């Protein structure tokens, strides 16, 4: 009754009893199924293990303020759209900036935006939009702003705690067979259900501040995927987010380039196979920003060393 043999027999029994990966081995490099929306952060991408947010799954991106939570969820919309996808933004904060969005790849013009008046309306015009099976990805800004009918009029009665549960229980099954990934957005309540409904929960907190004797811009953001049901949990990644420009595609190619030995840092002087790119990082990102082919091979080389 060989252990490793006994273990696998009883382990596979759960997957068929409770789900795909109700039981993962933190080491497993399991990769199948896909149909993922790249988040635009090669780093965070692999971090997820499937290289992107699993579609048709409910996702949560929590963090404090000015963390870049929205930035990521937006990059997600750009991509989903850029591949013939219909996006729906259920605004309840009214902070969204089109100018920052369009400059990331979003087709604002063809972007469904809705500004509910109550928590219930927000999670209705959203669950309804999910069932039309027309959307690919739909993000709801601020789980917090989703305040109940009352509390808006005159706590005591049904609070968000259930407001969120009800809608989740009814909307989880829906996108499940709709192929429409659902991004929630939190902000260190009803998140006591979302924490149990999400198949992927991301923890976005700002770490440092890229800068150059200048007045700063973006900020090295770190992301810890604390709950993942598609690939193994607890992985993390970091990526630059330039002020008013988004996540640095090129800048991510370096951090990942030298991390997987495709680039070298002799005297803080980067170089991709013989041909050096420049000194410092911001100068190397400026280089890759020009000639895309070179950056293209690199991206093409890391996409192989891993899926």
User: What is the three-class DSSP state of 162?
Assistant: helix
178 and 273 co-located in one domain? no
Please enumerate, by residue number, every residue annotated as part of a binding site. 66-71, 97-100, 187
242 and 294 co-located in one domain? no
Cβ neighbours around 29 below 10 Å, total = 10
Structure-derived torsion over alpha carbons of residues 37, 207, 303, 39, reported in degrees to the nearest 10: 10
**8 A C-beta contact, residue 241 and residue 71:** yes
Task: Tell me, yes or no, whether 2 lies in a domain.
Answer: no
| Closest by Cα among 186, 224, 179 to 206 | 224
| Closest by Cα among 253, 242, 248, 240 to 303 | 253
Burial class of residue 62 in the structure, from the number of CB atoms within 10 Å of its CB (0-12 exposed, 13-18 middle, 19+ buried): buried
180 and 194 co-located in one domain? yes
181 and 300 co-located in one domain? no
Please enumerate, by residue number, every residue annotated as part of a binding site for phosphate. 66-70, 187
179 and 305 co-located in one domain? no
**Dist CA 108 CA 126 (whole Å):** 18
Query: Determination technique for this PDB entry?
Result: X-ray
Q: Which helix (H) or strand (E) holds 302?
A: helix 292-305
- What are the φ and ψ backbone dihedral angles of 224, each rounded to 5 degrees? -110, 105
Give the distance from CA 123 to its chain's centroid. 21
User: What is the three-class DSSP state of 224?
Assistant: strand
> Looking at 247, 273, 292, which one is the last position of a domain?
247
202 and 91 co-located in one domain? yes
User: What is the three-class DSSP state of 217?
Assistant: coil
86 and 195 co-located in one domain? yes
Please enumerate, by residue number, every residue annotated as part of a binding site for ATP. 66-71, 97-100
**Dist CA 169 CA 174 (whole Å):** 9
162 and 88 co-located in one domain? yes
Instruction: Find the CATH number of the domain harbouring 34.
Output: 3.40.50.300
68 and 117 co-located in one domain? yes
**Dist CA 162 CA 217 (whole Å):** 40
Task: Tell me, yes or no, whether 67 lies in a domain.
Answer: yes
236 and 112 co-located in one domain? yes
284 and 209 co-located in one domain? no
229 and 283 co-located in one domain? no
Give strand ranges (E) for the chain: 36-37, 53-54, 58-62, 87-90, 112-114, 137-140, 181-185, 200-206, 221-228, 236-239, 241-242, 246-247, 264-265, 269-272, 275-279
Specify the number of domains making up the chain: 2
User: What is the three-class DSSP state of 81?
Assistant: helix
Task: Tell me, yes or no, whether 13 lies in a domain.
Answer: no
The residue range of the domain holding 48 is: 24-247
Q: How far is CA 167 from CA 61, 116, 160, in A?
A: 18, 15, 10
**Dist CA 221 CA 237 (whole Å):** 8
**Dist CA 127 CA 124 (whole Å):** 5
């Amino acid at each position: 009754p060989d252990r490793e043999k006994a273990l696998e027999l009883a382990m596979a029994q759960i997957d068929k009893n409770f789900g795909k990966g109700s039981v993962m081995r933190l080491g497993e490099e399991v990769r199948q199924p896909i149909s993922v929306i790249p988040t635009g952060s090669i780093s965070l991408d692999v971090a997820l293990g499937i290289g992107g947010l699993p579609r048709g799954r409910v996702i949560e991106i929590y963090g404090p303020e000015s963390s870049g939570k929205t930035t990521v969820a937006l990059h997600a919309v750009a991509n989903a759209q850029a591949a013939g996808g219909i996006a729906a933004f259920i605004d309840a904060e009214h902070a969204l900036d089109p100018e920052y969005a369009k400059k990331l790849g979003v087709d604002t013009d063809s972007l469904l935006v809705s500004q509910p008046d109550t928590g219930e309306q927000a999670l209705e015009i959203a669950d309804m939009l999910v069932r039309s099976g027309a959307l690919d990805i739909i993000v709801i800004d601020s789980v917090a702003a989703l305040v109940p009918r009352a509390e808006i009029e005159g706590s005591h009665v049904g609070l968000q705690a259930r407001l969120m549960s009800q809608a989740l229980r009814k909307m989880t099954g829906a996108l499940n067979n709709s192929g429409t990934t659902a991004i929630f957005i939190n902000q260190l309540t009803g998140g006591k259900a979302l924490k149990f409904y999400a198949s992927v929960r991301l923890d976005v907190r700002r770490i440092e501040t890229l800068k150059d004797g200048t007045d700063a811009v973006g900020n090295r953001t770190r992301v810890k995927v604390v709950k993942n049901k598609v690939s193994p949990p607890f992985k993390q990644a970091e990526f630059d987010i330039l002020y008013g420009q988004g996540i640095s595609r090129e800048g991510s190619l370096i951090d990942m380039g030298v991390e997987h030995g495709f680039i070298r840092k002799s005297g803080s002087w980067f170089t991709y196979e013989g041909e050096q790119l420049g000194q410092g990082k911001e100068n190397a990102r400026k280089f890759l920003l020009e000639n895309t082919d070179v950056a293209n091979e690199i991206e093409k080389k890391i996409k192989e060393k891993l899926g």
